[PDB]
C-alpha cells in the first residue's frame, strides 16, 4: 500500500484545500495536496486500533469481599459479608466504563474471569484454604440469605467452585434481550412522571453471589474477590464524544457540582507557543 | 495417559489472553442481530472526523469561548495564535483526536488542521498558516514563520481552508505522551495583511479550528489513559 505519492508544483482552477466546512463534510484533503512530496509506504493496518481490541482486553470491573468466620449468632448474614453478591454491570469501575461509553450500542460475548486472595489480619495460626463458590442469580431467581441456604444448591443455576489464591475463567455468551446492548437509554420504564430516567432500567442480568463453603476454621479469614471481564466478539455502533467530566454513579451521566476545569488553561498567551 | 511437562508461566493470569473458555450458559441462543446505521470497525475511522480545538484556553473556567480564535480588525503583521504539536496534550488534550490517541502510546501520520472564518460576509482578510517543523522555535513573527511549510489563504465564500501538517520526522513514530526527542514541532498563523471590516459593522470576528487525523494516521501499543479517574467504586 502507499503513504503518499510524489507531487510536483501546481497552479489551477481546482483548489483542493478550500472547502465549506459548514456542510458537515470533513474533507479528505491530504499532504500531497498542499505540497511537493515523494512516494512512500504504509506497512501498517492498525490491528491494534481495531474494535475487537480497543474494547476487548481483560480489565477489572468490580471488587468486593467476604469472610468465613463463625456465623453462630448472626441476625443477617449479608451484614456479615458471610456471603455476598453483585448487581452485574460495568459502570462500577470508570477505567473500562470510559472505553465502552465511546460508542452508543455495543455487542459481544464476554470472558468474566474471577480471582480471589485471603487475609488473616489477626493472630492466625495458619492460613487456611477455602473454596469459594460463585453463583449467578438470574433475575427472577430465589436468593441466598445465608452462606448455607438451599439457594446454594444451584440446581439450574450456573455456579463454579474454585479455590482461594486462585482463579476461574467462565465465559458467557452475550445475553441482551435485544439485538445489542443499550449504553445510554434516554427512556423510562413507563409514562409516569415518577419513574427513574436512565439505562438503570434496561440492564439487569441480575446478580452474582459468592460465599465460602467451609465451616469457619477458628481464627478469622477475609477474602477479597475480584472480577475481571474481557469483551470479545464485538461490534459497536454510533460513536460519540468521550467523557471529560468525571463519574458519579452507575448508569447516570452526572457530574458533580463545583468541579476543577477539564480544559487545561493556557499559561500566558494564545499567541504563546 | 499421555505424558506432559508443564512450563514456566503456569496459571499466570495475563489479562491480554485470547484463550478458549467454556460457556456458563450452554445451548443458549441469542437475540438476532439486526441492523444499525453507523458502525465502527476501527477507532481510526472515527478519528478522521473533525472536532474543535479550544485554541483559546486563557480563562478562569471552561468556555464555549475558549474555542473562538478571535480576529482583530485593521491590524497587521501581528500574530493570531500559536502552539506546538503534542497532540497528546495542551489544547489538543480534549478532542476526539486527543482523548483516543491518548489511549495509545505511539503515533504517526499527518494531521489535517482546519480553520473557518465567521466574519460578516462583506469583510475580508487574507492571513497565513504555518507549520514549523522541529529545530528552532515558535517563529516569532511572520518572516521567520514563512520559511516553514505554510499556506497563504484568501478569504472568500469558502469559509474553510484546510492546511495539512506534513508528517516531517526522522524517526518514524512518536511518543504520544510529551517527549523532546520524539517532539512534533509547532504552528502559528499571522495576518498576511489584515482584517477589513464593512461600514456600519464593528468589533471582532473569529476563526474556528478543527483538527482531524489523516488517511495515513498511525497508532500502536495500547496504554491506559490518564484523563479519567475514580478514587472509589461507584454506586447504584
Amino acid at each position, epitope marked *: 500500500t502507499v503513504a503518499s505519492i510524489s507531487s510536483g508544483p501546481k497552479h489551477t482552477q481546482k483548489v483542493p484545500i478550500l472547502t465549506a466546512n459548514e456542510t458537515g463534510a470533513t474533507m479528505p484533503v491530504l499532504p500531497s495536496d498542499s505540497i511537493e512530496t515523494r512516494t512512500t509506504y504504509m506497512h501498517f493496518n492498525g490491528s491494534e486500533t481495531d474494535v475487537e481490541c480497543f474494547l476487548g482486553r481483560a480489565a477489572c470491573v468490580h471488587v468486593t469481599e467476604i469472610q468465613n468466620k463463625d456465623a453462630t449468632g448472626i*441476625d443477617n448474614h449479608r451484614e456479615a459479608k458471610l456471603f455476598n453478591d453483585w448487581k452485574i454491570n460495568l459502570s462500577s469501575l470508570v477505567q473500562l466504563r470510559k472505553k465502552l461509553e465511546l460508542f452508543t450500542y455495543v455487542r459481544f460475548d464476554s470472558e468474566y474471569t474471577i480471582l480471589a486472595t485471603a487475609s488473616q489480619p489477626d493472630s492466625a495460626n495458619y492460613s487456611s484454604n477455602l473454596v469459594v463458590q460463585a453463583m449467578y442469580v438470574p433475575p427472577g431467581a430465589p436468593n441466598p440469605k445465608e452462606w448455607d441456604d438451599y439457594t446454594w444448591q444451584s440446581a439450574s443455576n450456573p455456579s463454579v467452585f474454585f479455590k482461594v489464591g486462585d482463579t476461574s475463567r467462565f465465559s458467557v455468551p452475550y445475553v441482551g434481550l435485544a439485538s445489542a446492548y443499550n449504553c445510554f437509554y434516554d427512556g423510562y420504564s413507563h409514562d409516569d412522571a415518577e419513574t427513574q430516567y436512565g439505562i438503570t432500567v434496561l440492564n439487569h442480568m441480575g446478580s452474582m453471589a459468592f460465599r465460602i463453603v467451609n465451616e469457619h476454621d477458628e481464627h478469622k479469614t477475609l477474602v477479597k474477590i475480584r472480577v475481571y471481564h474481557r469483551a470479545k466478539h464485538v461490534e459497536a455502533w454510533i460513536p460519540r464524544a468521550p467523557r471529560a467530566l468525571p463519574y458519579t454513579s452507575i448508569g447516570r451521566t452526572n457530574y458533580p457540582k463545583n468541579t476543577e476545569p477539564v480544559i487545561k488553561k493556557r499559561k500566558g498567551d494564545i499567541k504563546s507557543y | 495417559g499421555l505424558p506432559t511437562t508443564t512450563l514456566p508461566g503456569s496459571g499466570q493470569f495475563l489479562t491480554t489472553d485470547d484463550r478458549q473458555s467454556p460457556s456458563a450458559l450452554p445451548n443458549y441462543e441469542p437475540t438476532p442481530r439486526i441492523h444499525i446505521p453507523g458502525k465502527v470497525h476501527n477507532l481510526l475511522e472515527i478519528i478522521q472526523v473533525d472536532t474543535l480545538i479550544p485554541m483559546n484556553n486563557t480563562h478562569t473556567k471552561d468556555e464555549v469561548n475558549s474555542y473562538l480564535i478571535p480576529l482583530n480588525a485593521n491590524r497587521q503583521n501581528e500574530q493570531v495564535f500559536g502552539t506546538n504539536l503534542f497532540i497528546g496534550d495542551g489544547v489538543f488534550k480534549t478532542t476526539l483526536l486527543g482523548e483516543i490517541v491518548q489511549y495509545y502510546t505511539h503515533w504517526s501520520g499527518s494531521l489535517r488542521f482546519s480553520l473557518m472564518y465567521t466574519g460578516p460576509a462583506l469583510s475580508s482578510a487574507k492571513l497565513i498558516l504555518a507549520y514549523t517543523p522541529p529545530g528552532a522555535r515558535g517563529p516569532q513573527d511572520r518572516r521567520e514563520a514563512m520559511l516553514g511549510t505554510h499556506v497563504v489563504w484568501d478569504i472568500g465564500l469558502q469559509s474553510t481552508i484546510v492546511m495539512t501538517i506534513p508528517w516531517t520526522s526522522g524517526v518514524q513514530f512518536r511518543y504520544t505522551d510529551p517527549d523532546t526527542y520524539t517532539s512534533a514541532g509547532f504552528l502559528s498563523c499571522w495576518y498576511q495583511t489584515s482584517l477589513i471590516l464593512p461600514p456600519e459593522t464593528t468589533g471582532q470576528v473569529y476563526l474556528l479550528s478543527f483538527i482531524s487525523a489523516c488517511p495515513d494516521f498511525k497508532l500502536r501499543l495500547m496504554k491506559d489513559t490518564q484523563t479519567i479517574s475514580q478514587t472509589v467504586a461507584l454506586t447504584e
Partner: antibody
Amino acid sequence: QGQLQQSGAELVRPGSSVKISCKASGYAFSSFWVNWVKQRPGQGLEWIGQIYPGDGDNKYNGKFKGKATLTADKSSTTAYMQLYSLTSEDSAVYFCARSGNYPYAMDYWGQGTSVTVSS
Amino acid sequence: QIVLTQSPAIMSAFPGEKVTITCSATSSVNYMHWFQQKPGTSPKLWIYSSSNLASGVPARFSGSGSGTSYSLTISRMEAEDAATYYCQQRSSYPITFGSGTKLEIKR
C-alpha cells in the same frame, strides 16, 4: 466505648440537599456499619440505609433510593449521608447507629441531627 | 418487608401492674430486637435477639416468641416504664423497626 457524634440542627431551603454527619470514637469505624434512621416528629424509627467503611459495601431502603446517599470517610471516621431535593418530609430526624457487634442490632447509637426544610 | 406491629398501641400501667407487649410481623423474623424511647433521647437497645435483656435493661423486663410474633414483659410497670417501645426486625432486609407500644404509666 465509641461514639456516634452527629452533625448540628439543620435548616435547609426546600429543593436543596444537606449533609449531616457522624463520627466514631473508641471502636474501629472501619469494621461495623452505620445505619441511618428517619424518625420524623411523632414519627417512627425509619431506616434510610447502612454503609460499611471497610470497603464501601452497603444497602439502602427503597424509599430513599435517590434522597439518601450514605457515605463513610475512613480517616475522620465520619459517616455521613446527604439528602437531595429537600422537601418537608425531610423535616424529620436522622440518627446514625453502629451495627453488627452482632448479639445486638445497631447497638451503639448517636444523638441525631434536625432536618427542617423551609424557606 | 416483614411488616411489624407493636401489640397494644398503648395502655397505661399502674406501677406494679405487669406489662406485656408484642410484635406481630407478617412473615418470619427470627430475631426480635426490642428498642425503647423515653423522648428527648436516641432510641435504645433494650432486648436483643428475641429475649435478651440488653445492658442495664432491668429484670422486670423480658419477652420472646418467634417465627412471626414475639413479645416483651415487665413483671410490673414502674415509673421508668412510661416510655415507647419498638420491637425491631433485622432478619428480612430493608431492615425494619416495630410500630410502638407506647408504655404507659398509671397514677
